[PDB]
């Protein structure tokens, strides 16, 4: 089994100092073919060389670079040796729906896509009375789906008295936590009737004035 010595784990702060990840093939009796880095199982570009010892230089550390890096070693007649260097930072929410407008009796969905490592755990809450309260499954209309980076909350058979409000996703992990919000509003079925009555009233008063004028 080839021996790989890897650099120590790094935490990405807001500091502007670039980061170097190192790994050395200290012991190997096989004819090396190539070596190359991976992030989250994805090949990084322009990384294949002889590279009996390999250095990966990240000039601009951000949360969206933190990941489970490996430097995989492919030999002529030996199994690849991967190893692992973990880079972690506080999670950062990158995309969410700023508003959700649905008529009652339909389906609503809200998602909070983020980046970071460790893959954070997602919690949804409602802003009630100026504070945040954990949602209650109650009738079972709430479907919460969690994934490695993506989460979503879906509501079926939208009512008018509980559903409208503000929902927050909180996304916590070991390094830090990050939360964002979304506003949900449900439209009434008989809303269009009132302005129609207004138009009717204006027509009535206008015709009354005109016929009185004659």
């Amino acid at each position: 089994k080839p021996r790989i010595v890897t650099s120590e784990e790094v935490i990405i702060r807001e500091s502007l100092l670039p980061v170097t990840l190192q790994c050395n093939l200290t012991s190997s009796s096989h004819t090396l073919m190539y070596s190359y880095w991976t992030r989250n199982g994805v090949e990084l570009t322009a990384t294949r060389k002889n590279a009996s010892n390999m250095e990966y230089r990240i000039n601009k550390p951000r949360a969206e670079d933190s990941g489970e890096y490996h430097c995989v070693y492919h030999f002529v007649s030996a199994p690849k040796a991967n190893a692992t260097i973990e880079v972690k930072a506080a999670p950062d929410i990158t995309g969410h729906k700023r508003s959700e407008n649905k008529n009652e009796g339909q389906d609503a969905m809200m998602y909070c896509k983020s980046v970071g490592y460790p893959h954070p755990e997602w919690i949804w809450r409602k802003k009630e009375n100026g504070v945040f309260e954990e949602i209650s499954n109650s009738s079972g209309r709430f479907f919460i789906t969690n994934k490695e980076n993506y989460t979503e909350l879906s509501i079926v058979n939208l009512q008018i008295t509980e559903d409208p409000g503000e929902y927050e996703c909180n996304a916590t992990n070991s390094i830090g936590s990050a939360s964002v919000s979304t506003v949900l509003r449900v439209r009434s079925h008989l809303a269009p009737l009132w302005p129609f009555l207004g138009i009717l009233a204006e027509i009535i008063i206008l015709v009354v004035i005109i016929v009185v004028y004659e």
Binding site: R98, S99, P192, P195, F196, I199, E202, L206, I210, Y213
Partner: protein, 942 residues
Amino acid sequence: EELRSLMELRGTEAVVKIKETYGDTEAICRRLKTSPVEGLPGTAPDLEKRKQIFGQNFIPPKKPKTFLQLVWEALQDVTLIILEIAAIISLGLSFYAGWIEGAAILLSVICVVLVTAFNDWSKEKQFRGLQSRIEQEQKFTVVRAGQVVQIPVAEIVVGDIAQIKYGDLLPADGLFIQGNDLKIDESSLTGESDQVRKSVDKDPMLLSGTHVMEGSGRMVVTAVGVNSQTGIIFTLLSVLQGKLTKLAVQIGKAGLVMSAITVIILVLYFTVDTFVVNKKPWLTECTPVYVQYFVKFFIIGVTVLVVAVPEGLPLAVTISLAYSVKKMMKDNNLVRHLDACETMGNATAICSDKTGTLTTNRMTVVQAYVGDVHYKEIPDPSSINAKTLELLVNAIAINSAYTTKILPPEKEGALPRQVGNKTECGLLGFVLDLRQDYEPVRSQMPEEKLYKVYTFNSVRKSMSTVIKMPDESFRMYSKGASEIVLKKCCKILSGAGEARVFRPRDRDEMVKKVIEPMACDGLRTICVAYRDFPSSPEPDWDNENDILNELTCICVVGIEDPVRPEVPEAIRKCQRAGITVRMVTGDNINTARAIAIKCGIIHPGEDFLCLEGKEFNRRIRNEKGEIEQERIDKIWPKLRVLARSSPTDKHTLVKGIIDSTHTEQRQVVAVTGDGTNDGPALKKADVGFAMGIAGTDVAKEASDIILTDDNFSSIVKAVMWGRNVYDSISKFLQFQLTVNVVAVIVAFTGACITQDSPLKAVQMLWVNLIMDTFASLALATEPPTETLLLRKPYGRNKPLISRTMMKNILGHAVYQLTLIFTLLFVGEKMFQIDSGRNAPLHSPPSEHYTIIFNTFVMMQLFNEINARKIHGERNVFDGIFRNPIFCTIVLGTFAIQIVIVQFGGKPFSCSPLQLDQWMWCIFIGLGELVWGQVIATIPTSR
């Protein structure tokens, strides 16, 4: 052919030339492959053939411009070019989506140019249609196949035999064959105003473009089209618009200032917030985004400029005319010069002519003095004296012209046709009414017996004939105006069918009993006398003053023309509308006043002068023999009826009235003269009407407007349209100004509180299109109403924007501004649809700004209806359906607006809306009408 050199006789050269070539006029007539004076075959192929090769059509094309050059010219606007280059820069700079804005701006500019070009083309087509009809109206009498027929002037071809009467205008160059007393002025070609008398033996040349003065006859056309001696010269060759363009340039300057202020404010705010507040150096990496922000601000400014400045405002009036003239002909007002379409609206005085206008021009007899018995009604032949009918009918038949024949009625149960002299036709109709026929007498009465015929001349004032049928005697029959021949007659035939003693002693009693009642009733008097000349060795008939004396009067006939039933009401309406109508006529003062009192021109119990021409001329020439303005200044204001007036007197009256400074407001007059000598008088006035049914071509040539029915009421119609045009422009202006205010404000403070305007480039271009072009086509073409004659004529120094229009503009602008601001700042809460305020660059369209744009367009559409009334009328929907164009434009704009809001989101910076939002937008639109109804209660005087 050789005919081109055959003209320009100018003496007795071309006569010898035609003698050398063919001998005589009949010889060229036969060679011409043309039937002589008796007629013409008139077959279509032969006439069309001789029109192509042997002749030339009168069709100057003038080459009107086509659509391509029109759109090319429309594309030449500077502001549109600036917008185009700004859009190109923004499009290209997007790569160093975003191309959507540039593509939309390009397409909208192209569409606007196309629409403007189409509008101009349609207006020009309307004008060409009017010109085609004005050309069609012309007609000349010729003879073909032995039948006298009237044909369009464009149709005459070489060889046609044309009949020439006094006052006609010669259309083509021809040769004289037969006629009498053909005297024509040729001053238009030779410069000499002397009446050249044409004869077969001395000058048989007739030239087109010359005015026939006296005589009649026939001619054979030789040269037509550009081959004529008048076409060679051609081949080798308002008040309102000034105010409109002044207002346009003022508003353009204001808009330019506003646009510059907005752009500099945006740039300063952006640079101060980005660099001074936030500590950022002049980085070269973010230069493209900074210059893109600058280009966006510049595009906002350019759009503000392109909406603020009014383009095509001075062209508004023309549009109205282009959609009014074709309807004015329905009121029998055929207009030649468009400049008089609106000037007649300001007209304050109308000078009218008696015959033709106020009368029917038909002669009907009611009362007659015969047998020393007055008859208020037509008497039967039973009650009459001895030998008087036979002699009277014989004298009437012989003395009157034979060529004039009363046609059989054949009018499908209507009045019989009258041809010839009016008074003569009246006498013949009276004879036929008395159960006597003059045809048997005239058929057996040969022309040789009438050796001497004195035709009615101005000097002699009588018309008479002599026959030598009696043995050792002669019989003469005379007709006169009952004043000239009354002095001549010295015996009374009405005693017992025999002559009596007539003296100056009973001259007073007879003139009091006869002339005064007919004159009071409004009847011109015609007297018929006869005498028996003895067979002297040599009577001196040359001196008709003395030889034609000692007559016997057969009877006296009073003849008159009924006054039309429409003239009284029209005159009353004109006097109500601040226009004074005077009357000028050549008849005697008594009958003139009798007609005027019935027509309502002069009130019974009022001190209106009715002086005749003699006293008029004497009063204005009490000096050494010249006319001064000061003397006229005391005569014209109170002169109603003028009698025995030569046309030069009418010209003098018009000149004196038009340039007088006696009153504070300059006078504009309308004279309706018709005659061969009515040239200068008609031309001097501002607008000169002419007669259509019976009018000399010389009068029609120099007249601005012609009446195809001769009725006076038609003149009134002109006045109506002459006012309507002005009102139309007025109302259009109102609407536009309102929009032009709100837009500017909504883009200035919008660029001051925030960094963007609620309306983007394409939306504001659509607003510009709807506010200018469709508004001009919808509001500026409205039908006139009869209430336009209830206000006094407008002065010259009247401000273009009245107080009521300013009130309407300010009130509607205030309402629109407050509602749009409320929707912009607070409308996030009311609809619960988030906020588009402070949107980042390339932000997706948001409902918050789509609501603002939609409600703005809806307010404009529903305020366009409210702008149709200028004088504060509350019934905004009064007479809306009479103009289909307005309804079509409003409904089409509404449908296109719905399509634009619902679909085509990103290019137009709009987002789809639900029924709730649309319902509130329409609610606001109708609230606009409610506020417009409310504002009318504010008193503008206080």
